[PDB]
Amino acid sequence: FATGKWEYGSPKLERYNGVPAMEILGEPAPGLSSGDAMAAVEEIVKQLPK
Amino acid sequence: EDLSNYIVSNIQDPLSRTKGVGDFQVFGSQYSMRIWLDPAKLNSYQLTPG
């Protein structure tokens, strides 16, 4: 009375402030600051869905 | 009803975690899968609500 099939899931789920979220971490370029690095990150969220 | 569902789903918890907010009282509740039983069909199929 039972069968099975393969699917594609995620092993580690995470939430931030009560909503689903995903975590991206990195470093600035060598010889650069943190403020210009965060400013360079700040425009990339223009290119993501609604 | 959908307005109250939106308030308590997307709006309630961020302002409920803000500073100084001690209590929140909403007008209208969330969604819920309401199951209305009919007694005649329960009598016909020899069933209870239990």
Side-chain angles (χ1 to χ4, degrees):
Chain A
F1 61 95
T3 54
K5 55 172 173 298
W6 299 86
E7 286 180 9
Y8 202 57
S10 67
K12 173 203 183 68
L13 284 163
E14 50 189 0
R15 297 164 72 89
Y16 189 75
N17 290 145
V19 297
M22 262 173 178
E23 216 283 336
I24 295 96
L25 59 95
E27 278 100 339
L32 291 196
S33 74
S34 298
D36 71 314
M38 289 205 305
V41 171
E42 269 169 351
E43 86 261 7
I44 319 181
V45 304
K46 271 82 175 181
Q47 299 97 328
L48 49 78
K50 193 180 58 184
Chain B
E1 285 89 347
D2 43 350
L3 284 177
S4 51
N5 163 75
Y6 186 77
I7 284 296
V8 308
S9 46
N10 305 84
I11 281 183
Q12 168 193 304
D13 28 350
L15 51 87
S16 181
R17 293 187 193 91
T18 42
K19 311 293 186 185
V21 179
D23 183 74
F24 58 95
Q25 198 266 331
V26 77
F27 314 112
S29 48
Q30 46 194 6
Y31 280 162
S32 63
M33 193 61 76
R34 296 305 288 252
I35 302 174
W36 314 109
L37 304 163
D38 170 83
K41 293 143 179 303
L42 283 160
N43 193 15
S44 71
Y45 297 135
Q46 319 289 126
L47 291 181
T48 48

